[model samples]
Target: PPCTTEELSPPPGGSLVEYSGGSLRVPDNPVVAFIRGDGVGPEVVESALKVVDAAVKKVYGGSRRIVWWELLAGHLAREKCGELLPKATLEGIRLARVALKGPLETPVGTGYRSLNVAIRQALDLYANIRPVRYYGQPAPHKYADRVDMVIFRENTEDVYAGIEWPHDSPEAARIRRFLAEEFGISIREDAGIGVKPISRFATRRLMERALEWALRNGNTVVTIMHKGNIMKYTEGAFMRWAYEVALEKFREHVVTEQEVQEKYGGVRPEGKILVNDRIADNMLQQIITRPWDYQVIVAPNLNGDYISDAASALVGGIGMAAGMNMGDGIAVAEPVHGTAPKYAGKDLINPSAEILSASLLIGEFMGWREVKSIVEYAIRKAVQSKKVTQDLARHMPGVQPLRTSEYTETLIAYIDEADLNEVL
Candidate 1:
């Protein structure tokens, strides 16, 4: 039993998966939900599908495949279902437990505040995972090649909670009066008010997952980024709780920076993940100046938004930035770029981010690391060959840009030739 404008059917020859108790039970041929977002989304998503399908077919032959079910959202949902985000789409994703999607547009005026944020909130996908790694792409920084880090952002709280009252609204006036009368606090009437709530539960869960992922992926450092100095209770508490999670949940696996100094004489022990903390502003500067020192970063919602984007710029741009929103056992992998309306239907956008996002979901959910390796190898080969789409080509000198389809074909070709042993 499902709810949608049109009747849905499971793709023939494909199976669905189960997710419970914070784990995913995946099958060889899992049905994956996808949204062909707006603007350049369709073209890029098409490119990603082609490359990922090629890798699956090449790696496992006929034994494995993804039965892609298109879940309507954004413009298509509004057109067919008379709503921007149909309830059926959410149901479809929940049933499948995995997704690969392109960019969705947020209307300029006022409709849904943000389709992206709404989806994340509705599904309770609290971890915003972004991996910023260099792949020989032309970048602004001199040491761009050294920029490699994973950003784990708490997605649900802080400013992203959407609890603001407009400056001129009665809600703001009432809050100001309440603060003044009840707490003897003074606030300007013209000032807008917003709440920042950072709870121990949210912080610990995020830290636990981030630490788990870091250890699983062979990362040896995890930095908690926050503005704790200024916002003691909210941001500072975030830092304290994150450290507690590391000490309590992952005590044997992690070592604090101070512990390395006081106990180990500043020499990090073998096979121990270094857990550290930094002020948000200092962390931003360090990402550009000393990025190699950090492998995995855990941050509050707002700090993550800033740090992830800033880190992306060091390696390349958002075009190559791959992101995934993950919950207990549910994940929706999506490119970090928005719909570039000017590039819509032109087939000129790069799809590396989309394709890599597909690889992430597959590897993360199904434990299909070979597929991720193949895709990553192919993309690196494509970039090294100096054949890329407009976004990347513009940065490199004396290189011709490939259309979206051409780039996808190149990646597929490279996938067929990839050697797993040589990929690393």
Candidate 2:
């Protein structure tokens, strides 16, 4: 059967945008698809939507605005559409080409793998990009202010591919039996197996995007993180392929770490991004101890998963972490945090992550770069005022936490009333 969104259509009075060859053609009222996920998803997503509308109105007034089209998924989808991930949601995203989403709930150790993973795989959104930067939020690390880096994670491969079979399944049993029979490699009969397939095709594209972003954004370093010492072939090969892309595709703009030392006497030349590789474990520690040394990082699926969260921790937490998944002309922007089920509808949870995710969808993909600064400036002002959501207020004593709705209102006020020159 063909998948379709039979009843859904793009909103009238809003123009559809097109992305081609890395450029976006945005209209005055561009339609953007959005998912208000499970748990506290609705509340936070509402907050983000309000703040985004405020920024747009403040910046461009009535000249430009976003036309948001709601797409159902997760628990809400199940309630309305009888499916966790309905065909309409996928079709809506494909049609919109850009989207903003809140966190979706995925139970661990049981049930389906994850709707988040499913969406990424379904859309082939292969580059999971997370940009962690300081915003004057209370943080654990002393150097958190200097920690500015973007992570480009290979999204479709590695263990994240969801290829594992149960221990007692026929596929796992057959593989175990074949290994002992054909190669004399003994394995426990009950052991489950999973495949980690990292191809040059996926690796190259992820590398290419990361390198391009670095050059465009004026980042001076690009580090490839992998557990190459232990998983030599898969992880090591990822490191090799990433370096090859830099040398082959961006030879003029990139300088290898060795080249900086051998040819330039350890001084990285100007106008060149330093391309280097780091073992995953060491890279984790380095991000904590000396995050400023790294600017842009590219990694395989699992390593990127670990590193992105860790880097977010250095400057506040995932509650403020913003991310986007990009593949070709499609992109889905989302917060890096999960749905806090216990805090559902409490109205005290932080909405910064969702707001920043929307900023990515609008500023990065929609070509409204000034919108990002407006959102960030508002959040920064709110944080500096010592009144914030519970997640952040807990870190700073003598501060009263505002409800999620209140926080959103405060941010909107800042956007409307604050000096534009300050943001610029």
Candidate 3:
């Protein structure tokens, strides 16, 4: 068979799901694809499923459901289909349109690049939006409530393109020689060189969508962060391209940092998106103390990866950070954290990120506000109650941490009892 049978049985009383309508469209019982992932992926995504089911039930009461279509990926995919990412997995998502994925292992400096990045590339998912926010959880940091950022990371370009040669390889030496000989450019011949491509077209589209969303959602500022000052060609071009888009396309709605300073003395104009910039090196240092000031942060690939992980530490951590990767119509939501191999089969890791990752679909894909509300209320209540998983419990004193299932169960009870305003 073609990579072991492609079709998966749909949920009870449901058929296949596809999103081929306009910009935004979702069915009542939408057929959605899901990947249990590797390691703790099963439990984390399981917890996500329970909360998703409870939210759908609490809001629509059986009228709406996620007709789940499971697909293999990561370690399991290699075991079952002899491939890290099966062709069938891509086909399923292309058919289903939206998916929720848990963590998949991506070993550093080893075999292939991340299968997670592979999913984005196969689906043409160009924008990776990772939301790092605080739920008033008992945090280790004193500025526990200050962090609230949604990093709009460009997905398809830069170093993440997997274009480069291995260290001390002949290919690396050959490429370095070609650049030096042909273009009069000098390079360290021994260094493993990576091609960081930042296209004008890519920078334009990604910035446009992210800025528009910020404006539409009432966000105050959009900081175009980059290490442009040093990597003057690649990273610098991204910063310049971002400004060009802001000044040309969103001229009426956007205000540059200099303009805002001249016009309103550092106070931004009402009902306008403030566009700003910060050096990546300095941005990382100021992020924790100056978290509240920055709203929607956008950048190229490498910077985004570092920025998102760093910001995740401020608001509890990556376990509490939810990520959304999308392009045009399709989106694949997942936890920003990695797969905990040691904690596999052990019910202990936090499920907030996974659940919130699913909630991104409910809010953006299904357009179900009440479903989003149920998720939000439940998370906020859970953290406030201090009966969270081990991650958050580390910060609290004398508070017994719940197992993975216990945390999910507590959240389910709170959501089931939430005084919900029906969008039915």
Candidate 4:
């Protein structure tokens, strides 16, 4: 069977209930794949799983549950399967259709190619969604509350496509020679060669997904962010394609300011969706100064990489960053940070990012509202009550720094108390 059956083996002190399956029922309970990443990944993943369990128990009165199929990827996969991303892991994600993972390390030019990027490309997971928000956490930023935006990043193409010839390589020399001879373009000897590929197919699909998300979520604006001033054909094409998608797919739902000006004497329709653009460099400043103006942002891979990290920094560091790599029917959730090798196995790393990512996975796939609510509540209470890992503890006063497992315990306790509506 393309879709196999799996039983939900709820954790101790939990119950299981069957949910009505629509159209096709793959399993009684949703089965989610998970990859315990490299370095501190295992520690944080343990914490995340514990929190997920507690929320599941609290939500369904111990009924509806998840069947977790653990898959090996990243460094652990290299150790056990002799490949950074084992074929079995990819197959598991394909079968399960959704997954949650911790940080995976990608050492440049070493220890296997980027497993995360490789999985994304292999699965054709072209949309990277990152929802940035401020839940009143203590951070170095002065305006954390002002930064809340959802980034819809085109995942497969642009500079991240890995079409590059290293400096002084024979391929680089050949490309340089071809460009100079055929196109009359001269390249400096020291310049490395890299190809940026942005296609209408990908650009349109990404923007289409972004628009669908905005319309469904009642978002007001979708911003096209790119560095089109240079690399006009590639990045510029991305912006133009986004506009085309907006007009073609969501015309009735949105009205461009220029259209409003010409049609309604410069008055925009109340609550009409807005589509706009911003230069990539200026977008950095605008995100910090006026983040409220943007609801959804669509950008190419390279620009998305830069801006997503910057947006994460506005609320907190990448330690709390959550991301989803999504295609048509499959999605993988993971923290945006890489493996902190120095903090590996120390039991002191923060797992909230990955934990919340798991929450997102459950909500999206299973539509388990109670689990989502309890998990979210636990995370908020943990951060607000000053019970945090060392990363957040170092900056805050009188906060107790908990180990990875201890943090998980606190998260479970918080969820238990919240569900019972009692103080502990």
Candidate 5:
């Protein structure tokens, strides 16, 4: 079926304005927006594009291609439009339907805001999907093979909704005064105020996506990770909402251990799609001890931000963490890491994270299995060869370190020269 730009499946109401371009072609070649963010963003993005192009060429023999439209956002957008996330970039993503971006810079307390968060909120990208796995290459890890999990984060609204005031702001003072006088609670004068808002609507939607993905992927479990013990109203509510949605909507496909015990008078078979929950803090310990036990995890924003990074450390560093912010029709794939401005402009960064993200983008949009296979093979081979950037190279002695460009070239070369079926 040719792709059509109707409202994004679960539309963002009137906020999403669509443009008519006359029977828009869904290109035999996929059309994806590429935002080469700030700092090492450009370098990493360039490498990712190269690797993507190589894989497509190798697998599809140039029949399939990616029309990468460069959009301005983040620092570049701030420079051009005086705004970090411009309407142009948002519209481009809307039209293209799928996008790939490098790391974007977020200025601390500058009110410049997070460009990634703004895009997610504006587009109503509700599912932040992150797939972490071991590459089986050279890296420091006590247990690498036991660390494969896909994280489905509620993307749209959470503490990440950015409803916060600085420590010394008038807004903070007003809220504090209200709490002290009316609610009989005192807040430190120097403490900042950040609201954590979780809704039944948002929580259910994210869990629904996670369950759907798990069923499709033959995953055996979907663990709800939350800090419900502390924030009962917000994070705790998220956990309740998630379980409610699962039991109500996906009852036939999922069963809890508790439910199995009550229904069948014993624990269900291990093959059942088990639904479970774990406190956020405890999950950190659980991942290390029994990482292989869990397949998919659904979490609120703040916990997800921390857990995903911690999960990344188990298999590799943040240098290889791939993520995507997915809405109904619009999905933007990118690395989980932010722009390390300190490492900007130098060819001294790892592109693996974004490269893997682009590979997933191709798989999702174009259904190009061979392309994904070859790209994954190239990455694994690159890691095995130890021809990596400074980040991974630091751990291995007597290993040849490749600059950002060199690493990208090697990945592309691997794809161009190797057989797709044999490489993996």
Candidate 6:
């Protein structure tokens, strides 16, 4: 028996968009793929679809729209096609070069790998950008209103590269013996082992994208978060290379944090972005204590995994965070929350994350700021008025939270009536 592979599985529907050299050939009324991820993923995806559809109608008034191609992945794909990531699903993303996704569940303490990581690495989606900002609603933190940070995580490197050995396995013992024999090292006989690999080429490109984001978003600081004191070669090398990219490529508009203090009396240069570095541990504290001191923060994979969640929690939590993973050309946006199996089929989960993520997909990938604004207006209007899902309702005092479906209905109506703001 043999397996077959084809370039265009199921063929692109509305239009074929090609990506080459960090640019996309976007089509008018583009065909975009959506994966209703496992658990509450389907619920949120449904809500997001309704919200985006309403936004399109409100913005374009029956002229332009998104043609969604709902695909399969995660557990659903495994059930349907006997594969976690179906052949057609990957092909669809390749054909369109973009996708909107819901939260996927990777079984804990299991042999299965995460579908999200798999897709990202498969597509070479090297940048996971999570923009942390405040909305017009109430959250738990006092600094919530004051904190706004956009994190640029190196998505495809470090420990997330998924190179590890099981405890007491033959490969683990073999590597352990080699390490001891070659370098006079000692290891626990029963300990598992893993490797963290980082390369300058990977560092160079990741920093370029992070810096490009800082420049594009008008963020004044780009802090490189790492554990350089401990992992000197990998994290330290990353720190140096990031500066290399900034100084070599964007020197005119960039300055190191040391230079900002030494040369400019602690004042930001007129239009230059302040570049800085911090150990991963201290970076966590710096964010919550002095949130204003940072703007665009970049870190290696594992550190970013910690930092992004921390930043999100300082404002609200994953329910409101929108995450995007992109490479040179490919892009996929999703809510930065987990699949809460308890909330599955209850119609009680927060839909804002998915809605905002879809809006980001349109705004960042499709260049439709107007549509994104409408989505934001719909969301903010509902939350500010105290009508929300349970997540937000718990934080607010008097107003009752609507059911999942009710909230979606309100959001759709709001999109139709939302007045656009300049900031969106």
* Candidate achieving the largest TM-score: 1
Question: RMSD in angstroms, candidate 2?
Answer: 2.7
In terms of lDDT, model 3 sits at: 0.82
The lDDT of each candidate is 0.86, 0.87, 0.82, 0.78, 0.79, 0.82
Model 2: CA > 4 A from native: 1-4, 106-111, 166-170
Residues 1-424 of candidate 1 have per-residue lDDT tens digits of: 2238366667777899887676668898899888887998888888888898899988787688888888877877788777777888887887788999889888776544678877887798999999888888888888788787889999989987888999899899999999999999998988988999999999998998899888878899999999999999999999999999899979999898889999999999989999999999999999989888888999999999999999888887668899999988889999998888998998888888898889888875566878987888888788899988878888888899998899999998897777656763
lDDT tens digits by residue: candidate 2, 215-283: 767889999999888888899999999999899999999998789999999999999999999989999
Model 3: pairs clashing at backbone N, Cα or C within 3 Å? none
Distance (Å) between predicted and true CA of 248, model 3?
3.7
Tens-place lDDT per residue, model 6, 49-117, is 888989888787877777787788877777766766776677678767779998887767545467677
State in Å the error of residue 320, model 4.
0.8
Which candidate would rank higher by lDDT, 1 or 6?
1
What TM-score does prediction 3 earn?
0.88
For model 5, the run of ten residues with the poorest summed lDDT: 8-17
How far off is residue 76 in model 4, in Å?
Answer: 4.0
Which prediction has the highest lDDT against the true structure?
Answer: 2
TM-scores for every candidate against the unseen true structure: 0.95, 0.92, 0.88, 0.86, 0.84, 0.89
Task: Report the C-alpha displacement of residue 193, candidate 1, in angstroms.
Answer: 1.9
Overall local distance difference test of candidate 5: 0.79
